[PDB]
Amino acid sequence: APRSVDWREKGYVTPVKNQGQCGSCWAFSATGALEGQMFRKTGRLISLSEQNLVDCSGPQGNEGCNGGLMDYAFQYVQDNGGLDSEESYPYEATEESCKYNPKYSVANDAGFVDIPKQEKALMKAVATVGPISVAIDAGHESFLFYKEGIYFEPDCSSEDMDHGVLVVGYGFESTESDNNKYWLVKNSWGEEWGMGGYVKMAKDRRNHCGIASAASYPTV
Amino acid sequence: APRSVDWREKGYVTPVKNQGQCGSCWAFSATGALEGQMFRKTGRLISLSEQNLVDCSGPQGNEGCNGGLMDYAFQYVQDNGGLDSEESYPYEATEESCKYNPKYSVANDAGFVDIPKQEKALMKAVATVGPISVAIDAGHESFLFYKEGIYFEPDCSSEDMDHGVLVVGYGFESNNKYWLVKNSWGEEWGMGGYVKMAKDRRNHCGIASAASYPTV
Amino acid sequence: APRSVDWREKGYVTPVKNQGQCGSCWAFSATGALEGQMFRKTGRLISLSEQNLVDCSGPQGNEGCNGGLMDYAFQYVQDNGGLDSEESYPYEATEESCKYNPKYSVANDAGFVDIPKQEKALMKAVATVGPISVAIDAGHESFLFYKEGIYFEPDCSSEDMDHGVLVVGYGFESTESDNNKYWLVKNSWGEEWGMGGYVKMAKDRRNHCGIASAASYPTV
Amino acid sequence: APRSVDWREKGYVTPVKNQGQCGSCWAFSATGALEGQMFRKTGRLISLSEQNLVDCSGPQGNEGCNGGLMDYAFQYVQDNGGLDSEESYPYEATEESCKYNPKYSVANDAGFVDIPKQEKALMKAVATVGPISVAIDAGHESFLFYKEGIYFEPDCSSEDMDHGVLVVGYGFESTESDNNKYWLVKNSWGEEWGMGGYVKMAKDRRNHCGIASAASYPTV
Ligand SMILES: *[C@@](O)(C(=O)NCc1ccccc1)[C@H](C[C@@H]1CCNC1=O)NC(=O)[C@H](CC1CC1)n1cccc(NC(=O)OC(C)(C)C)c1=O
Ligand SMILES: *[C@@](O)(C(=O)NCc1ccccc1)[C@H](C[C@@H]1CCNC1=O)NC(=O)[C@H](CC1CC1)n1cccc(NC(=O)OC(C)(C)C)c1=O
Numbered sequence: 054a055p056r057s058v059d060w061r062e063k064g065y066v067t068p069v070k071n072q073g074q075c076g077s078c079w080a081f082s083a084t085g086a087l088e089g090q091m092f093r094k095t096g097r098l099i100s101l102s103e104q105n106l107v108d109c110s111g112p113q114g115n116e117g118c119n120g121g122l123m124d125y126a127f128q129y130v131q132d133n134g135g136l137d138s139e140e141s142y143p144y145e146a147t148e149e150s151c152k153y154n155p156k157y158s159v160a161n162d163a164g165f166v167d168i169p170k171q172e173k174a175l176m177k178a179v180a181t182v183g184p185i186s187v188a189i190d191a192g193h194e195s196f197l198f199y200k201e202g203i204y205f206e207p208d209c210s211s212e213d214m215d216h217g218v219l220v221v222g223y224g225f226e227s228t229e230s231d232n233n234k235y236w237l238v239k240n241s242w243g244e245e246w247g248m249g250g251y252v253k254m255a256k257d258r259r260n261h262c263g264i265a266s267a268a269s270y271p272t273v
Numbered sequence: 274a275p276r277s278v279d280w281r282e283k284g285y286v287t288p289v290k291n292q293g294q295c296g297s298c299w300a301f302s303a304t305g306a307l308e309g310q311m312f313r314k315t316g317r318l319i320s321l322s323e324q325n326l327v328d329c330s331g332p333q334g335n336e337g338c339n340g341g342l343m344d345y346a347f348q349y350v351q352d353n354g355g356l357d358s359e360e361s362y363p364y365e366a367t368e369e370s371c372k373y374n375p376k377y378s379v380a381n382d383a384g385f386v387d388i389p390k391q392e393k394a395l396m397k398a399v400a401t402v403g404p405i406s407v408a409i410d411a412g413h414e415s416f417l418f419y420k421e422g423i424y425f426e427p428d429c430s431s432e433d434m435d436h437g438v439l440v441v442g443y444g445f446e447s448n449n450k451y452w453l454v455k456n457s458w459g460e461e462w463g464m465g466g467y468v469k470m471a472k473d474r475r476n477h478c479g480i481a482s483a484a485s486y487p488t489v
Numbered sequence: 490a491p492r493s494v495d496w497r498e499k500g501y502v503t504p505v506k507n508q509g510q511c512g513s514c515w516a517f518s519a520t521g522a523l524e525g526q527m528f529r530k531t532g533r534l535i536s537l538s539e540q541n542l543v544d545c546s547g548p549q550g551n552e553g554c555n556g557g558l559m560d561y562a563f564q565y566v567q568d569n570g571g572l573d574s575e576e577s578y579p580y581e582a583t584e585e586s587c588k589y590n591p592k593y594s595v596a597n598d599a600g601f602v603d604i605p606k607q608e609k610a611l612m613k614a615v616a617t618v619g620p621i622s623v624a625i626d627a628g629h630e631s632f633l634f635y636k637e638g639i640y641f642e643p644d645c646s647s648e649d650m651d652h653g654v655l656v657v658g659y660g661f662e663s664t665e666s667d668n669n670k671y672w673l674v675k676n677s678w679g680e681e682w683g684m685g686g687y688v689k690m691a692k693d694r695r696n697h698c699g700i701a702s703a704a705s706y707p708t709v
Numbered sequence: 710a711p712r713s714v715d716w717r718e719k720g721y722v723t724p725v726k727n728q729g730q731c732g733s734c735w736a737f738s739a740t741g742a743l744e745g746q747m748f749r750k751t752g753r754l755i756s757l758s759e760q761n762l763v764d765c766s767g768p769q770g771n772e773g774c775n776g777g778l779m780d781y782a783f784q785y786v787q788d789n790g791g792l793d794s795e796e797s798y799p800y801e802a803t804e805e806s807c808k809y810n811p812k813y814s815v816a817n818d819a820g821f822v823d824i825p826k827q828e829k830a831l832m833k834a835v836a837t838v839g840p841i842s843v844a845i846d847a848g849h850e851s852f853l854f855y856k857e858g859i860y861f862e863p864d865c866s867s868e869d870m871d872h873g874v875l876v877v878g879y880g881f882e883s884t885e886s887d888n889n890k891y892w893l894v895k896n897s898w899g900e901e902w903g904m905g906g907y908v909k910m911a912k913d914r915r916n917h918c919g920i921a922s923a924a925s926y927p928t929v
């Protein structure tokens with residue numbers, strides 16, 4: 054793979070959003086990945102509606118503000134034949150009935166690809182596909198208060214991921230030989246969290262925080 | 274009262290502590306306030322045991338990691354006749370049976386003083402007494418994510434406080450005046466663990482509505 | 490020696506100060522070290538006057554806002570027979586004539602000790618003496634913007650130190666690169682810089698930024 | 710966490726070994742932790758070579774029979790790409806030139822985790838990771854002479870440790886008793902010392918003998 058990747062510089066990534074007090078991180082991970090793949094297919098970046106997923110993707114297994122899975126969101130988009138734009142179907146941070154309108158659909162997918170559960174495979178997918186939906190163990194005070202640098206949490210689990218986010222690149226700090234490597238990760242807690250709403254997550258430390266345990270992207 | 278106050282400069286304030294995953298903010302606010310009044314009385318700054326309060330002040334109304342009140346903690350120290358040092362009774366972030374040892378008491382109090390619920394009264398207290406225990410509305414993600422600057426949260430309620438902290442001073446922009454507030458979330462939170470809260474903005478986050486300190 | 494030391498927890502360290510736009514970092518390093526040794530002796534923590542050093546220790550070789558050395562400041566306090574409190578002789582961030590007044594002296598020393606130029610000797614001094622004055626290379630953008638974590642600058646020189654600061658302890662934390670040890674360093678750029686005015690400088694990494702190359706403390 | 714943990718009952722722990730008159734306690738603590746993480750990852754318990762560490766991990770900071778650190782041993786395994794089995798590279802109790810052969814490597818790691826200096830942190834790590842390397846203050850004749858019971862030494866330091874051992878569990882005096890909890894600790898002085906070569910060290914008594922002051926384990 055390339056030594057570093059940052060899909061923001063290629064036009065694939067919308068600004069950081071804020072999910073508010075609703076357990077919809079999975080929907081923000083899913084729209085981020087679908088935004089990237091739609092741009093890859095069309096050359097146009099269009100922010101997509103998390104609310105559409107929160108309200109409408111129950112039949113695929115999602116539970117609105119009580120949690121969900123990015124793969125279930127990609128399955129909804131496939132089953133439904135579409136997903137509305139963020140502009141047409143804005144985010145309210147609470148679960149309501151479905152108001153999908155196919156006239157405002159700006160995305161589609163044909164299913165999804167689950168990446169093999171190791172970081173070399175994840176790197177190859179980030180480098181060759183675009184931004185990748187992942188699940189991480191974010192269940193630590195240290196994650197809430199993250200400011201800068203490469204996030205490494207000694208109590209992180211590679212099995213108990215609880216938070217959906219989006220890998221938009223990877224790279225290294227310091228001298229390359231120091232192996233000070235990170236994943237560049239877009240969160241959905243607004244730009245006041247973290248580094249402008251981003252976190253650099255420990256990379257190539259045997260799947261730290263489970264970042265490679267449940268990674269996928271939609272097929273467009 | 275002076276235009277600005279910072280009790281850290283006069284030796285009244287211990288380093289920032291970390292309560293961890295236990296709902297014991299009330300105990301850190303209490304030890305903070307008692308640490309300051311004990312220094313005011315004796316000239317000695319000794320870090321005091323939050324674990325002692327978590328484990329032992331049930332009879333006064335406190336519920337350990339499930340919450341509590343600074344005044345109930347001050348009441349416990351009075352009833353108990355003392356309070357152990359932090360070093361003698363260190364913090365475990367979980368509730369256990371009481372292990373108080375009078376031989377390791379380093380602090381006492383004779384009750385407590387609740388301050389009238391106005392920011393002018395709070396300012397006089399800070400200026401003349403020392404660090405003051407206060408309750409604030411901290412239930413907003415903006416407070417979780419705070420790092421620098423003067424904190425102001427549109428959605429902050431002046432009547433639904435949920436978090437005990439310690440006012441160690443106040444200052445001005447030059448009016449975006451502020452209270453200098455020690456938290457108990459470790460040094461990585463906020464400005465080395467401190468937050469500047471909006472001062473004189475309609476009792477922002479209820480900072481003056483439940484202010485108090487122990488009588489030493 | 491211990492694996493972790495923090496003299497702030499033992500009462501040896503005043504709050505972070507702000508030297509402003511005057512090249513007086515050496516004076517703040519010196520007062521911090523003497524504040525610690527005076528506390529060790531008397532049990533009383535008294536903030537000391539940097540302005541007294543800036544205005545008055547020229548005869549020992551210091552040059553006010555144009556630079557100085559902690560050892561010259563310790564020599565001044567010895568030669569002069571005292572040093573005024575911060576409250577009696579407050580900081581103006583500009584060089585003026587000497588206004589030292591012995592009636593307001595609150596500190597003394599009988600010289601200083603220069604520590605051998607090895608991080609292991611710095612460690613034993615920090616462990617057994619208290620806060621130690623040191624000189625570091627702080628001339629890098631990364632140092633200005635430091636917010637948290639262990640500071641490591643690949644371009645840092647161990648021979649061109651330009652900045653006096655104060656080691657108040659040392660410790661460890663898990664990191665991506667497994668360079669986990671740090672010196673806990675008090676700066677003089679106010680509380681808004683770094684972590685409450687502190688930085689965790691890389692420890693046991695080939696004398697990173699020269700932190701063990703010009704270490705000393707006053708003899709009280 | 711569970712109220713009691715004993716990783717020996719899960720297959721994570723090799724029999725007690727005897728370091729002899731060589732200052733290699735750090736190498737035994739390290740192989741013990743790596744034996745546990747290799748079992749966690751592969752389901753196979755294979756005894757590992759302390760001799761390989763004694764002879765070969767000088768480049769990482771270790772000094773053979775003159776002392777060393779578990780973290781440096783874990784770094785060696787990462788740098789070296791492997792570690793030989795006990796059987797392939799048996800223990801000689803004296804420093805020799807390195808005889809590592811990659812054909813007999815049975816263990817690997819990608820660095821290590823230093824646990825924060827709290828007994829509650831150590832408790833969580835033991836409950837969720839497996840056996841943990843620790844440093845303790847063993848510099849008392851009471852430790853030399855230990856045979857049975859819960860070890861408590863009034864002169865024990867919580868800051869200055871001198872001996873590397875392996876926490877394999879923890880336990881209690883009785884279900885509803887805060888008193889006489891213990892860490893279950895594997896030593897490397899053979900099975901005639903202590904309790905079949907194990908010691909129950911006072912737990913939750915102000916981090917007794919420093920057991921939580923320098924705890925770590927390899928990343929696998
Ligand atoms: C997501 O992390 C999120 O929206 N975070 C911000 C937030 C947290 C809590 C409340 C409001 C906002 C989301 C949070 C969940 C749903 C509600 N409470 C939570 O903890 N996480 C998930 O939806 C997460 C996504 C998958 C990729 C990892 N998720 C989905 C489905 C099930 C679970 N967990 C689960 O079943 O856990 C057990 C322990 C089995 C109950 C899950 O975390
Ligand atoms: C305190 O704010 C705290 O420890 N914060 C960090 C923290 C929060 C949650 C979990 C772990 C750590 C503390 C937080 C409480 C206890 C656990 N959950 C909470 O929300 N706040 C209090 O203990 C607080 C203190 C008073 C001075 C302001 N407090 C005391 C007693 C009762 C309540 N709340 C309450 O009764 O709320 C309702 C919902 C009305 C029952 C309270 O906040």
Ligand SMILES: *[C@@](O)(C(=O)NCc1ccccc1)[C@H](C[C@@H]1CCNC1=O)NC(=O)[C@H](CC1CC1)n1cccc(NC(=O)OC(C)(C)C)c1=O
Pocket residue numbers: 508509510511512513514515554555556557558559623624625650651652653703
């Ligand atoms: C100190 O770092 C400081 O006050 N920094 C903040 C600051 C910088 C510039 C202007 C205002 C505030 C201090 C900075 C010096 C003096 C003014 N310009 C500087 O760069 N550093 C020292 O005084 C430093 C202390 C020793 C322990 C390291 N110091 C002392 C004496 C000489 C030099 N440098 C020097 O002669 O450099 C050459 C290249 C030869 C001119 C020095 O850095």
Ligand SMILES: *[C@@](O)(C(=O)NCc1ccccc1)[C@H](C[C@@H]1CCNC1=O)NC(=O)[C@H](CC1CC1)n1cccc(NC(=O)OC(C)(C)C)c1=O
Pocket residue numbers: 490728729730731732733734735774775776777778779843844845870871872873
């Ligand atoms: C280990 O404890 C051991 O092998 N003990 C049995 C033994 C003792 C003496 C001689 C032969 C066998 C080991 C003992 C050391 C090496 C030889 N002399 C000793 O006392 N301890 C260490 O290697 C220990 C490991 C760390 C986790 C605690 N260790 C490592 C590095 C440095 C030191 N000490 C040190 O620097 O001490 C001072 C006095 C501060 C210089 C250390 O003990």
